Amino acid sequence: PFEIEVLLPGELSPAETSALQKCEGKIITFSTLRHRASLVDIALSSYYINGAPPDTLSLLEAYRMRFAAVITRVIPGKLLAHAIGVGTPTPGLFIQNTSPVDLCNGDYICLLPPVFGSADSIRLDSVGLEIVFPLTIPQTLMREIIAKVVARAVERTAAGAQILPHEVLRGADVICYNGRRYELETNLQHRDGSDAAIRTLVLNLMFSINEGCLLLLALIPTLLVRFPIYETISSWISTSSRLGDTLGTRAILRVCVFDGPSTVHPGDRTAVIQV
């Protein structure tokens, strides 16, 4: 079995040590696999590109190229972890639920950058870095979650762009799972992540789609009863293909619970099988 050891730093405050003890079964994502690694690869510092902190669209691309791992146990002077990579037969693999939705048996696990609310994370002020943990949501809910968040942002731009808003609506959006509703983003104020991390995500989505039902309407005018005209096609194919690989859905784990509670709430830990 392949395992990665993260070296705990010296002269760490006891409060930061106790909080590290809490995040036992959480997911770490490693750039390059090696038996010995440093905290710089775990901190958010290794994640940001072009100097600025990373973006949601950038984080989605980070999770694909970068390899994931799972913490197993912490030690007052050492930190261990196991990989979900090539062939490792990890025994007793358990994870902690980080998403607000509940999980059940036979549910596959995917990953997602934090979108709903402010991401919780451990912050080490002494060393000067923080470690952000990814969100773990089921598969069936993942494709719906993304479509609802982006559609929410376009509604805000429309209400600002249009001279008058078209406010008349159904109420508040909500995601239901196992007879439990989530009622996300009740208030219109508190635009915390409206355009803070999903800004560029909406832009690229607002251009490829606009090119979608426009190119067809400009190529076959029979649908509704100087100019390249080909480089636009090649550019549209190259973009829409890359964007699709970005917003992919690939399960990473399966929740296989034996002699235990079927349904599990945010904060509990369950044994999972490597898919």
Binding site: N50, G51, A52, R242
Partner: protein, 334 residues
């Protein structure tokens, strides 16, 4: 067309030279602990790959300094002292022009008459890397950063170890409090530190939000997407620091051969590749100074007609010739 507007420039360049060092150490300088080896059976590509591993620990038993190092000799130069301008068209984020043909023609004209330029298709969602040329001639080219200034500027200031910012700064002028590195970097209500008779040299690249300072500061992130290196970055970044000991100890500890900030494979001096670990000694960076090399506004006054040494006139009629005052005086054949 050659019409000279009302502005002058200062060019800043950075070079690196491979040197030979000499190290001395005391007798009992460190305590070394070695553990026991471990074996790791592991499958391989065709067979098996055993891995041996051994831990060790090191502690310096010094009540002071027990080791010294000195750069003794000089080997061949690595980079080249060419004339390669820096293209500011490798970045994105600034407020553009209202008309797109304007900026297209601007970029085309800037690319014309240069060496490094972004690729023409201008790939969206990319790095905007320059085109890879053919074989290299005599070493890695080094970029040059331009800073604007008034025309009638003191020429005697460029004859010694000056500072490109126009005003002396650094954490080497302290003694009472901590809120003084910020005081002497932009506050123009008091005289300069070095030349205690004026605020700055050029009032266009030394204020809090002057043109040069807005161009590159590190905290503004104007050239985040640019893959090329910028040598004038360290003279503008404020370089925060805390107070734990006296200035002498802080100075003695800062000089420790910090990591590099370039690449030794490409020919354009790109940014430091993430993951490459090579240590280089960086003088004149902890002092915030630069040495002026042998330059001259005119070429005729550069060499005398005696088949030998070079001329050293200062000013002929309106031109000038700056005598070399760099550490590299008895090298670099002519």
């Amino acid at each position: 067309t050659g019409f000279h507007p009302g502005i002058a420039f200062t060019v800043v360049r950075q070079d690196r030279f491979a040197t030979e060092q000499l190290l001395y150490a005391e007798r009992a300088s460190e305590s070394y602990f070695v553990g026991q080896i471990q074996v790791h059976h592991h499958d391989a590509i065709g067979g098996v790959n055993f891995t041996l591993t051994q831990p060790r620990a090191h502690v310096d038993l010094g009540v002071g300094y027990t080791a010294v190092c000195a750069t003794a000799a000089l080997r061949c130069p690595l980079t080249d002292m060419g004339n390669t301008a820096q293209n500011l068209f490798f970045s994105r984020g600034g407020v553009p022009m209202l008309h797109d043909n304007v900026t297209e023609s601007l970029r085309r004209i800037t690319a014309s008459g240069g060496r490094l330029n972004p690729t023409e298709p201008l790939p969206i969602f990319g790095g905007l890397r320059p085109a890879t040329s053919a074989g290299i001639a005599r070493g890695q080219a080094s970029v040059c950063e331009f800073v604007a200034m008034p025309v009638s500027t003191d020429l005697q200031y460029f004859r010694t170890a000056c500072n490109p910012r126009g005003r002396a700064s650094g954490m080497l002028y302290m003694g009472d409090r901590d809120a003084d590195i910020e005081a002497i970097m932009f506050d123009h209500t008091q005289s300069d530190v070095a030349y205690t008779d004026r605020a700055t040299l050029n009032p266009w690249a030394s204020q809090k939000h002057s043109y040069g300072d807005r161009l590159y500061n590190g905290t503004y992130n104007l050239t985040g997407a640019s893959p090329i290196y910028s040598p004038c970055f360290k003279f503008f970044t404020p370089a925060e620091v805390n107070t734990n000991c006296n200035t002498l100890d802080r100075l003695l500890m800062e000089a420790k051969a910090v990591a590099s900030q370039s690449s030794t494979d490409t020919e354009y001096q790109f940014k430091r590749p993430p993951g490459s670990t090579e240590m280089t000694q960086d003088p004149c960076g902890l002092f915030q100074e630069a040495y002026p090399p042998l330059c001259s506004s005119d070429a005729a006054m550069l060499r005398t007609a005696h088949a030998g040494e070079t001329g050293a006139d200062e000013v002929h009629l309106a031109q000038y010739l700056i005598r070399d005052a760099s550490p590299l005086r008895g090298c670099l054949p002519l």
